[PDB]
Design an enzyme around this catalytic site. Structure first.
Site, PDB file in Angstrom:
ATOM      1  N   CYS A 105       0.840  -1.187   0.000  1.00  0.00           N
ATOM      2  CA  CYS A 105       0.000   0.000   0.000  1.00  0.00           C
ATOM      3  C   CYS A 105       0.881   1.245   0.000  1.00  0.00           C
ATOM      4  O   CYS A 105       1.683   1.444   0.921  1.00  0.00           O
ATOM      5  CB  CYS A 105      -0.947   0.027   1.211  1.00  0.00           C
ATOM      6  SG  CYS A 105      -1.983   1.508   1.174  1.00  0.00           S
ATOM      7  N   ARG A 108      -0.300   4.751   2.733  1.00  0.00           N
ATOM      8  CA  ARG A 108      -0.230   4.536   4.176  1.00  0.00           C
ATOM      9  C   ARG A 108       0.156   5.777   4.969  1.00  0.00           C
ATOM     10  O   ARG A 108       0.294   5.675   6.190  1.00  0.00           O
ATOM     11  CB  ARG A 108       0.757   3.416   4.524  1.00  0.00           C
ATOM     12  CG  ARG A 108       0.286   2.039   4.174  1.00  0.00           C
ATOM     13  CD  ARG A 108       1.307   1.024   4.652  1.00  0.00           C
ATOM     14  NE  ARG A 108       2.452   0.921   3.742  1.00  0.00           N
ATOM     15  CZ  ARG A 108       3.509   0.139   3.958  1.00  0.00           C
ATOM     16  NH1 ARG A 108       3.563  -0.611   5.066  1.00  0.00           N
ATOM     17  NH2 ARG A 108       4.502   0.087   3.056  1.00  0.00           N
ATOM     18  N   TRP A 277      -9.184   6.089  -1.633  1.00  0.00           N
ATOM     19  CA  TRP A 277      -9.377   6.766  -2.912  1.00  0.00           C
ATOM     20  C   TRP A 277      -8.298   6.296  -3.873  1.00  0.00           C
ATOM     21  O   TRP A 277      -7.260   5.778  -3.461  1.00  0.00           O
ATOM     22  CB  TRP A 277      -9.350   8.292  -2.789  1.00  0.00           C
ATOM     23  CG  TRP A 277      -8.181   8.869  -2.061  1.00  0.00           C
ATOM     24  CD1 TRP A 277      -6.943   9.108  -2.573  1.00  0.00           C
ATOM     25  CD2 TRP A 277      -8.145   9.322  -0.703  1.00  0.00           C
ATOM     26  NE1 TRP A 277      -6.136   9.683  -1.623  1.00  0.00           N
ATOM     27  CE2 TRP A 277      -6.842   9.811  -0.460  1.00  0.00           C
ATOM     28  CE3 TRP A 277      -9.085   9.357   0.334  1.00  0.00           C
ATOM     29  CZ2 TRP A 277      -6.449  10.331   0.773  1.00  0.00           C
ATOM     30  CZ3 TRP A 277      -8.696   9.878   1.569  1.00  0.00           C
ATOM     31  CH2 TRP A 277      -7.391  10.370   1.770  1.00  0.00           C
ATOM     32  N   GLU A 282      -3.508   3.532 -11.094  1.00  0.00           N
ATOM     33  CA  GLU A 282      -4.201   2.239 -11.030  1.00  0.00           C
ATOM     34  C   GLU A 282      -5.273   2.154 -12.101  1.00  0.00           C
ATOM     35  O   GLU A 282      -5.419   1.126 -12.777  1.00  0.00           O
ATOM     36  CB  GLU A 282      -4.830   2.014  -9.660  1.00  0.00           C
ATOM     37  CG  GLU A 282      -3.891   2.104  -8.474  1.00  0.00           C
ATOM     38  CD  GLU A 282      -4.645   1.958  -7.138  1.00  0.00           C
ATOM     39  OE1 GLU A 282      -5.042   0.813  -6.775  1.00  0.00           O
ATOM     40  OE2 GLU A 282      -4.853   2.996  -6.463  1.00  0.00           O
TER      41      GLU A 282
HETATM   42  C1  HEM Z   1      -6.738   6.446   0.702  1.00  0.00           C
HETATM   43  C2  HEM Z   1      -5.789   6.318  -0.229  1.00  0.00           C
HETATM   44  C3  HEM Z   1      -5.127   4.975  -0.652  1.00  0.00           C
HETATM   45  C4  HEM Z   1      -4.287   4.869  -1.681  1.00  0.00           C
HETATM   46  C5  HEM Z   1      -3.840   6.036  -2.586  1.00  0.00           C
HETATM   47  C6  HEM Z   1      -3.870   3.492  -1.809  1.00  0.00           C
HETATM   48  C7  HEM Z   1      -3.009   2.984  -2.753  1.00  0.00           C
HETATM   49  C8  HEM Z   1      -2.701   1.646  -2.952  1.00  0.00           C
HETATM   50  C9  HEM Z   1      -2.108   1.046  -4.151  1.00  0.00           C
HETATM   51  C10 HEM Z   1      -1.714   1.803  -5.432  1.00  0.00           C
HETATM   52  C11 HEM Z   1      -1.971  -0.256  -3.932  1.00  0.00           C
HETATM   53  C12 HEM Z   1      -1.415  -1.312  -4.893  1.00  0.00           C
HETATM   54  C13 HEM Z   1      -2.577  -1.711  -5.806  1.00  0.00           C
HETATM   55  C14 HEM Z   1      -2.196  -2.908  -6.655  1.00  0.00           C
HETATM   56  O1  HEM Z   1      -2.120  -4.055  -6.105  1.00  0.00           O
HETATM   57  O2  HEM Z   1      -1.962  -2.713  -7.888  1.00  0.00           O
HETATM   58  C15 HEM Z   1      -2.468  -0.533  -2.603  1.00  0.00           C
HETATM   59  C16 HEM Z   1      -2.494  -1.769  -2.027  1.00  0.00           C
HETATM   60  C17 HEM Z   1      -3.043  -2.072  -0.816  1.00  0.00           C
HETATM   61  N1  HEM Z   1      -3.782  -1.193  -0.053  1.00  0.00           N
HETATM   62 FE1  HEM Z   1      -3.869   0.907  -0.214  1.00  0.00          FE
HETATM   63  N2  HEM Z   1      -4.484   2.783  -0.810  1.00  0.00           N
HETATM   64  C18 HEM Z   1      -5.276   3.649  -0.079  1.00  0.00           C
HETATM   65  C19 HEM Z   1      -6.054   3.287   1.006  1.00  0.00           C
HETATM   66  C20 HEM Z   1      -6.057   2.057   1.642  1.00  0.00           C
HETATM   67  C21 HEM Z   1      -6.869   1.649   2.777  1.00  0.00           C
HETATM   68  C22 HEM Z   1      -7.914   2.557   3.472  1.00  0.00           C
HETATM   69  C23 HEM Z   1      -6.557   0.369   3.079  1.00  0.00           C
HETATM   70  C24 HEM Z   1      -7.096  -0.561   4.200  1.00  0.00           C
HETATM   71  C25 HEM Z   1      -7.842  -0.155   5.234  1.00  0.00           C
HETATM   72  C26 HEM Z   1      -5.523  -0.063   2.151  1.00  0.00           C
HETATM   73  C27 HEM Z   1      -4.926  -1.312   2.116  1.00  0.00           C
HETATM   74  C28 HEM Z   1      -4.162  -1.859   1.093  1.00  0.00           C
HETATM   75  C29 HEM Z   1      -3.613  -3.206   1.016  1.00  0.00           C
HETATM   76  C30 HEM Z   1      -3.769  -4.314   2.067  1.00  0.00           C
HETATM   77  C31 HEM Z   1      -2.948  -3.339  -0.121  1.00  0.00           C
HETATM   78  C32 HEM Z   1      -2.188  -4.602  -0.597  1.00  0.00           C
HETATM   79  C33 HEM Z   1      -3.051  -5.550  -1.417  1.00  0.00           C
HETATM   80  C34 HEM Z   1      -2.597  -5.474  -2.857  1.00  0.00           C
HETATM   81  O3  HEM Z   1      -2.093  -4.396  -3.262  1.00  0.00           O
HETATM   82  O4  HEM Z   1      -2.721  -6.485  -3.604  1.00  0.00           O
HETATM   83  N3  HEM Z   1      -5.255   0.996   1.297  1.00  0.00           N
HETATM   84  N4  HEM Z   1      -2.902   0.642  -2.028  1.00  0.00           N
HETATM   85  C1  LIG Z   2      -8.297   0.682  -0.504  1.00  0.00           C
HETATM   86  C2  LIG Z   2      -7.537   0.823  -1.802  1.00  0.00           C
HETATM   87  C3  LIG Z   2      -7.211   2.084  -2.264  1.00  0.00           C
HETATM   88  C4  LIG Z   2      -6.504   2.231  -3.466  1.00  0.00           C
HETATM   89  N1  LIG Z   2      -6.215   3.475  -3.875  1.00  0.00           N
HETATM   90  N2  LIG Z   2      -6.143   1.161  -4.218  1.00  0.00           N
HETATM   91  C5  LIG Z   2      -6.471  -0.075  -3.761  1.00  0.00           C
HETATM   92  C6  LIG Z   2      -6.088  -1.274  -4.562  1.00  0.00           C
HETATM   93  O1  LIG Z   2      -5.980  -2.381  -3.694  1.00  0.00           O
HETATM   94  C7  LIG Z   2      -5.958  -3.635  -4.240  1.00  0.00           C
HETATM   95  C8  LIG Z   2      -6.072  -3.819  -5.612  1.00  0.00           C
HETATM   96  C9  LIG Z   2      -6.053  -5.102  -6.143  1.00  0.00           C
HETATM   97  C10 LIG Z   2      -6.148  -5.270  -7.644  1.00  0.00           C
HETATM   98  C11 LIG Z   2      -4.737  -4.987  -8.181  1.00  0.00           C
HETATM   99  N3  LIG Z   2      -4.620  -5.120  -9.639  1.00  0.00           N
HETATM  100  C12 LIG Z   2      -3.287  -4.675 -10.062  1.00  0.00           C
HETATM  101  C13 LIG Z   2      -3.916  -3.472 -10.749  1.00  0.00           C
HETATM  102  C14 LIG Z   2      -5.285  -4.012 -10.346  1.00  0.00           C
HETATM  103  C15 LIG Z   2      -5.913  -6.203  -5.295  1.00  0.00           C
HETATM  104  C16 LIG Z   2      -5.808  -6.000  -3.923  1.00  0.00           C
HETATM  105  F1  LIG Z   2      -5.687  -7.026  -3.061  1.00  0.00           F
HETATM  106  C17 LIG Z   2      -5.828  -4.724  -3.407  1.00  0.00           C
HETATM  107  F2  LIG Z   2      -5.725  -4.533  -2.081  1.00  0.00           F
HETATM  108  C18 LIG Z   2      -7.167  -0.272  -2.565  1.00  0.00           C
HETATM  109 CL   LIG Z   3      -8.646  -1.188  -8.962  1.00  0.00          CL
END
Ligand code: HEM
Ligand SMILES: Cc1cc(N)nc(COc2cc(CCN3CCC3)cc(F)c2F)c1
Ligand SMILES: [Cl-]
Ligand code: HEM
Ligand SMILES: Cc1cc(N)nc(COc2cc(CCN3CCC3)cc(F)c2F)c1
Ligand SMILES: C[C@H](O)[C@H](O)[C@H]1CNc2nc(N)[nH]c(=O)c2N1
Ligand SMILES: C[C@H](O)[C@H](O)[C@H]1CNc2nc(N)[nH]c(=O)c2N1
Ligand SMILES: [Cl-]
Ligand SMILES: [Gd]
Ligand SMILES: [Gd]
Ligand SMILES: [Zn+2]
Lengths: 401, 401
Positions: A105, A108, A277, A282
């Site tokens: 993430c 954070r 948001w 993405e």
């Molecule tokens: C509010 C602005 C936030 C932004 C800009 C943001 C951005 C991102 C991005 C770009 C990713 C990687 C996405 C991908 O896998 O391609 C990510 C992953 C993740 N986000 Fe955040 N996020 C936000 C809020 C949150 C919140 C509120 C939570 C949980 C309460 C959260 C939890 C996670 C987790 C667990 C991942 C890892 C899972 C994964 O990426 O496969 N995020 N986030």
């Molecule tokens: C809360 C929140 C905010 C934010 N801004 N972005 C996210 C994306 O989170 C996730 C996205 C995916 C799909 C990823 N694929 C690669 C491109 C699509 C899987 C996850 F397990 C996520 F956790 C979550």
């Molecule tokens: Cl998405």
């Protein structure tokens, strides 16, 4: 104790927090597997113990009276019932830590600003749907997006799990066509088939919003349609390329992940949807230009009358950059919160310094923190990182089907 | 226990069985991943044995006459002297295999085409210099670039050491100020400090080709002035932004890595400079746009009248694509071999499939194989990879002081 260098500035820190790393990952000294996307009463106690220590450390009553009672309460309750219930304050503290601990993430810097909804008294798929509609309603907030998480009843012996079958609260249908192709989003061909099979009359647009499949314990999933006026969407247009709105592209405002398991002090909440948001990449890069996603990159570059026969014209990069510009412009036009990968990485660096002061390090998976375009233009590119797993945490879990 | 490796663009699956051979151990443990960090007596016989057994397998001579025969001579060579000399073909075979095993090299599809000059009989810096100069003039080839490597005499105990002090054969000067800040290339500030200390007259340019600091065993370095007609360079201009030429930018043709240490069959060659041809993003994105390198991004964006006031304008991304277009354009115009990052990564995927059939996998460090711009637009972003250390190999080595 890893030494971590930042190459932009030249600074050096040591991630002392990586020694506290509990659950083990997929790398060994023989071979690194970091780029892989998908890598009992006594141990419930030591996870629970650890979390309660964490919780009391955060409230400055470490080692105190209340501390002793809680540890004793949790043990006696595991011995008596095989499990234990989190207090409300401890639950809020663990949703926040789980976010603060998500290594992939980038958002954070926001971890302490998290609206936690306790839905642990939920009872059915119908109550579950109501809690979700209210989550969407509060998070969305007419475009002024707020971070929220709704926590549904924890996994426990004797009863099935609450599960949201949808990977996200807002998904677009993916219909496999006649000629093996896909209309709409290909990442959602499967959830789309399941929804049909459970009685959803399909559409045939590229942006049909998917119904929810909501599983109460020991129950088949049930189909729930989202009210159209709850799903705020942004039509995509370009500030200078006016033919761009003739593409009919749209995306949704609210990124709400719904298939991840939340882990707190040994307890497991397999249904705890969370939402923030979007970052423009993405949508702009990944969702719309990924060759296995909407894959618009070529059609945009042809409209831009770029030379697509050769790659050294960098038509791919030129088209992609204007697709992001369009995403940022459209969202700000519609007054829906959005952050560009420069500002997001900038402020994630501020997270990294705040974390070093507070815990002595920060779990970060470099390959996910660096944006999918312009990587080395951001400052997180030049920052070395250390990837480890702390609890509380959000973990992947298998699909219920 | 054979790592499952997925490609997400297509969905294919392969198993890396080659990873089992990883003799030397990397920096990751199950506790924490350090993949994004740049850096961290008759055992010689075991390294020499296995390297020899590779060689004879690669020529379908596994277990026949000369195979056992050559094995005996190593045993006896080391028994008498405590070290050994490589049959020249083994030197060539190991030179190519070290390239084939470099996890961070995206151009390895070219691995079988390597010119190995044998400088093993070198003694003196004036001797090196000419071995170097023949390398340079051979590899440059009037701009038709050819992979080459020159292998200077291996290290043995009690001896001195052959070392090329410069990180590369072609490096631009970096000059500090009455206010600190650097004119020229800040990556080379230090070696410029040394080059001057040993008597070099400093220039006043931002593209001042440094002298060389060659060093022979147990002797101080000797400065060497490279001949200007050997240092082929490319002035940078942009096809349609005619002011770009005015900026006064240049880069050289020959990417020539001196300071790395060839390691074959248990022998260590601390002076073994290799060379090939550039990928455009190394020059345009890393060398010219890194904040700690030339850092021209804002300057190019001003000249494009971009809105540098807000980061959501993606002015950084726009200027970077143009700086890359100009590097490609300029090299193609000067008839100097260059390759863009879409052509390169697509050729690396053809490499991985080649390597699957051949050795059952390939060691690849994902963070350096994905280009520093447009990463997810290239197919290697969507390819899971496994990083491990095979031998022979190029290793980083401490600075010769
Ligand atoms: C509010 C602005 C936030 C932004 C800009 C943001 C951005 C991102 C991005 C770009 C990713 C990687 C996405 C991908 O896998 O391609 C990510 C992953 C993740 N986000 Fe955040 N996020 C936000 C809020 C949150 C919140 C509120 C939570 C949980 C309460 C959260 C939890 C996670 C987790 C667990 C991942 C890892 C899972 C994964 O990426 O496969 N995020 N986030
Ligand atoms: C809360 C929140 C905010 C934010 N801004 N972005 C996210 C994306 O989170 C996730 C996205 C995916 C799909 C990823 N694929 C690669 C491109 C699509 C899987 C996850 F397990 C996520 F956790 C979550
Ligand atoms: Cl998405
Ligand atoms: C022929 C065209 C070649 C291209 C286009 C190419 C490209 C690259 C690139 C882009 C990197 C990125 C690593 C970084 O930026 O630090 C790299 C690393 C590397 N290459 Fe290649 N390369 C080529 C030939 C060679 C040859 C001939 C050798 C040796 C025989 C070689 C050995 C290495 C090594 C050891 C590294 C990693 C060392 C380091 O980056 O610190 N390459 N290459
Ligand atoms: C043979 C060859 C061909 C090619 N095309 N490129 C290279 C560059 O390899 C290297 C580059 C650097 C400089 C790193 N700078 C910081 C960011 C860039 C250091 C090394 F130790 C390399 F090995 C080598
Ligand atoms: C296979 C490869 O590691 C995979 O595509 C990863 C790389 N880095 C990523 N980074 C982000 N932010 N999101 C992703 O989905 C991925 N995918
Ligand atoms: C911190 C990070 O691992 C480091 O800056 C790496 C990332 N990827 C890179 N990739 C290339 N080609 N060159 C580099 O110097 C780096 N630097
Ligand atoms: Cl370079
Ligand atoms: Gd226009
Ligand atoms: Gd002007
Ligand atoms: Zn690792």
């Amino acid at each position: 104790f890893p030494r971590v260098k930042n190459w932009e500035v030249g600074s050096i820190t040591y991630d002392t927090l990586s020694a506290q790393a509990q659950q083990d990952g997929p790398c060994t000294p023989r071979r690194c597997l970091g780029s892989l996307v998908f890598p009992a009463p006594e141990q419930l106690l030591s996870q629970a113990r650890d979390f309660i220590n964490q919780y009391y450390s955060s409230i400055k009553r470490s080692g105190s009276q209340a501390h002793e009672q809680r540890l004793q309460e949790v043990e006696a309750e595991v011995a008596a019932t095989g499990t234990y219930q989190l207090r409300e304050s401890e639950l809020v503290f663990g949703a926040k830590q789980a976010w603060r601990n998500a290594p992939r993430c980038v958002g954070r810097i926001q971890w302490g600003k998290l609206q936690v909804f306790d839905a642990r008294d939920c009872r059915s798929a119908q109550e579950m749907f109501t809690y979700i509609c209210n989550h969407i309603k509060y998070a969305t907030n007419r475009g002024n997006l707020r971070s929220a998480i709704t926590v549904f009843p924890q996994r426990c012996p004797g009863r099935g799990d609450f599960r949201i079958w949808n990977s996200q609260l807002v998904r677009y249908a993916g219909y496999r066509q006649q000629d093996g192709s896909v209309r709409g989003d290909p990442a959602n061909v499967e959830i789309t088939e399941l929804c049909i099979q459970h009685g959803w009359t399909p559409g045939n647009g590229r942006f049909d919003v998917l119904p929810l499949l909501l599983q109460a314990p020991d129950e088949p999933p049930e189909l729930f349609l989202l009210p159209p006026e709850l799903v705020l969407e942004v039509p995509l247009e370009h500030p200078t390329l006016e033919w761009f709105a003739a593409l009919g592209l749209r995306w949704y405002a609210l990124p709400a992940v719904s298939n991840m398991l939340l882990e707190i002090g040994g307890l497991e909440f397999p249904a705890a949807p969370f939402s923030g948001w979007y970052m423009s990449t993405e949508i702009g890069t990944r969702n719309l230009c990924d060759p296995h996603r909407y894959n618009i990159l070529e059609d945009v570059a042809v409209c831009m009358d770029l030379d697509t026969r050769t790659t050294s014209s960098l038509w791919k990069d030129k088209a992609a950059v204007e697709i992001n510009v369009a995403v940022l412009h459209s969202y700000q036009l519609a007054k829906v919160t959005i952050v560009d990968h420069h500002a997001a990485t900038a402020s994630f660096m501020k997270h990294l310094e705040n974390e070093q002061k507070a815990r002595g390090g920060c779990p970060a998976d470099w390959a996910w923190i660096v944006p999918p375009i312009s990587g080395s233009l951001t400052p997180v590119f030049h920052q070395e990182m250390v990837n480890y797993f702390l609890s509380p945490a959000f973990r992947y879990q298998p699909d219920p089907w």
